[PDB]
Amino acid sequence: AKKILVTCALPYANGSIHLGHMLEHIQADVWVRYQRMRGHEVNFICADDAHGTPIMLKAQQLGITPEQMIGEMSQEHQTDFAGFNISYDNYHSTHSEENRQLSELIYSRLKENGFIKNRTISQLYDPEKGMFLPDRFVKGTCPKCKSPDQYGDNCEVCGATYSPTELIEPKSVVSGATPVMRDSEHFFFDLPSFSEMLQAWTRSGALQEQVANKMQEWFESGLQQWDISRDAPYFGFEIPNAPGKYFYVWLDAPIGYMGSFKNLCDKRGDSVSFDEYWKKDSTAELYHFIGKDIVYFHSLFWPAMLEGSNFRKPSNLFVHGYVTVNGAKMSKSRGTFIKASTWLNHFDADSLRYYYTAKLSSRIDDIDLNLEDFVQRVNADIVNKVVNLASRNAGFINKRFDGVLASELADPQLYKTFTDAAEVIGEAWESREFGKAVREIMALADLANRYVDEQAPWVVAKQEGRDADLQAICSMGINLFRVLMTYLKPVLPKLTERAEAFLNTELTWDGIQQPLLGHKVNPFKALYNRIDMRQVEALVEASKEEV
Numbered sequence: 102a103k104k105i106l107v108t109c110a111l112p113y114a115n116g117s118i119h120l121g122h123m124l125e126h127i128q129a130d131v132w133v134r135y136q137r138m139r140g141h142e143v144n145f146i147c148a149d150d151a152h153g154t155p156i157m158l159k160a161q162q163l164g165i166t167p168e169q170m171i172g173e174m175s176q177e178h179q180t181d182f183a184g185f186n187i188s189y190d191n192y193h194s195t196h197s198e199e200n201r202q203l204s205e206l207i208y209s210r211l212k213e214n215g216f217i218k219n220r221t222i223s224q225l226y227d228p229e230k231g232m233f234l235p236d237r238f239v240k241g242t243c244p245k246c247k248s249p250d251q252y253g254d255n256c257e258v259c260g261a262t263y264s265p266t267e268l269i270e271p272k273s274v275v276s277g278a279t280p281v282m283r284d285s286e287h288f289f290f291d292l293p294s295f296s297e298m299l300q301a302w303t304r305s306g307a308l309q310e311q312v313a314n315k316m317q318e319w320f321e322s323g324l325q326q327w328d329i330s331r332d333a334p335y336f337g338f339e340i341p342n343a344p345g346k347y348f349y350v351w352l353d354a355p356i357g358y359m360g361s362f363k364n365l366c367d368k369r370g371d372s373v374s375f376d377e378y379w380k381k382d383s384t385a386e387l388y389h390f391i392g393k394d395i396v397y398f399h400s401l402f403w404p405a406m407l408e409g410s411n412f413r414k415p416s417n418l419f420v421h422g423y424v425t426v427n428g429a430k431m432s433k434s435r436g437t438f439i440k441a442s443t444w445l446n447h448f449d450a451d452s453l454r455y456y457y458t459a460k461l462s463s464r465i466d467d468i469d470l471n472l473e474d475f476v477q478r479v480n481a482d483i484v485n486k487v488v489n490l491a492s493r494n495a496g497f498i499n500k501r502f503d504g505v506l507a508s509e510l511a512d513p514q515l516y517k518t519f520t521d522a523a524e525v526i527g528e529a530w531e532s533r534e535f536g537k538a539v540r541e542i543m544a545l546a547d548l549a550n551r552y553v554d555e556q557a558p559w560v561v562a563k564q565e566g567r568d569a570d571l572q573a574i575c576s577m578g579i580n581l582f583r584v585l586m587t588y589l590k591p592v593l594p595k596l597t598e599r600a601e602a603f604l605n606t607e608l609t610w611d612g613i614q615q616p617l618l619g620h621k622v623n624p625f626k627a628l629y630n631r632i633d634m635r636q637v638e639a640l641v642e643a644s645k646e647e648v
């Protein structure tokens with residue numbers, strides 16, 4: 102049995118979960134559920150990314166401690182993920198004792214190994230508030246067009262880019278005071294020292310083609326030392342032997358993957374698994390599901406950090422593209438910037454899980470949630486192809502045969518066609534070619550419905566002496582449904598539970614080899630109802646009203 106540790110990117114604690122986050126967590130969850138179905142030891146891990154200046158400043162504005170704020174956001178995030186049935190084995194926080202000790206440990210090892218450098222830099226400083234200002238917290242007049250109230254390194258009027266130091270009449274977004282250039286000693290991680298190791302990993306063929314291509318661009322530009330320290334005031338971990346200095350959030354963030362797993366092991370009283378998964382000689386597999394905007398950190402900084410601190414590196418990175426709604430980036434004004442919590446007020450989790458899965462592939466291309474297509478696809482595939490197989494046949498079995506299925510398969514050849522497809526479909530789930538798996542499953546659904554139409558149970562039901570035939574036909578349809586729901590189990594957790602209740606059996610991957618014969622099924626009420634555009638319109642309107 103394989104040992105697998107899977108993670109999803111750690112959501113920032115200063116924002117609600119939206120459909121963008123959900124694409125990633127759903128993709129990983131489908132993969133994880135499939136791996137569990139094949140009998141592997143799987144540890145699905147995540148946590149909130151809780152450090153940084155943005156978080157510190159937000160807490161101060163709300164008039165509460167950063168700890169209180171991140172605690173409330175952690176609860177909000179977990180409630181949303183639970184609503185979508187993302188099956189984490191542990192959801193922790195980067196702001197934890199586990200992460201603090203691991204961050205200090207890794208830093209100490211990197212420093213001891215000569216990978217940490219000291220360097221003085223100049224940066225905008227708020228003398229009133231008494232804090233260095235990241236670019237986004239510096240505002241002023243654009244040097245080019247002279248437009249007032251511009252933020253950071255760019256003007257939203259003429260579109261010019263520039264260093265905040267070029268801003269005319271600079272002002273702190275925090276206090277409004279005029280910022281000044283101030284010196285400060287910073288600690289840097291020597292990423293360049295790992296260039297050759299990283300280049301070898303890029304050409305190993307493990308990473309997605311598009312990712313490797315991107316990495317070549319970064320090597321061409323040239324790797325640079327990475328500033329991993331920030332001055333107080335800051336919400337994060339203090340650097341050992343360096344009063345007033347903290348670890349930059351991105352240094353401790355990925356270590357949070359380790360911290361969350363350590364936390365899980367510690368809670369389980371498991372004293373051996375952490376090392377079995379993170380030591381250099383590990384035989385366990387480590388996978389990170391991430392978006393394209395954070396590939397640099399995960400493919401370059403992260404593996405280098407682990408290498409330099411004597412830990413194993415990721416087995417692979419699974420990158421996905423952005424989520425668009427109706428073909429465009431989510432838009433607050435159009436009501437397409439949809440929160441996970443809002444989605445659940447209008448639709449169930451299975452619908453979105455299915456739609457995303459039907460569109461996902463092993464590539465990093467963007468995934469589009471076309472709302473019109475969403476309604477059409479869910480109704481056509483879930484309600485009319487899969488669930489229909491159960492709903493059109495269960496009635497006769499329950500009313501005419503006391504809920505008992507036939508003692509033999511009416512069409513063994515057809516059933517074999519269905520079970521024979523397990524290898525290819527499982528390989529599709531395994532390789533993350535989700536769209537392919539769904540297409541294969543729906544092709545089978547079409548054959549199943551063709552079979553029922555060919556047999557015409559609604560005709561056989563009204564013909565005297567055809568009772569045995571009716572039971573045979575309907576039982577066959579229900580067994581085909583059993584197989585289809587097994588292949589879709591990683592995708593539709595709730596519908597699967599309802600299906601298992603109806604079938605009076607847990608669905609296992611190998612179980613399809615034994616059809617349900619002379620078996621009692623239970624009556625059920627609507628396994629899955631149709632949706633309509635009026636609900637989509639309501640979702641959009643509700644989303645507009647929020648912002």
Ligand SMILES: N[C@@H](CCSC(F)F)C(=O)O
Binds near residue numbers: 356
């Ligand atoms: N919070 C980051 C992802 C961190 S993933 C790992 F490094 F912690 C983000 O939302 O981009």
Ligand SMILES: [Zn+2]
Binds near residue numbers: 245246247259260261
């Ligand atoms: Zn301008």
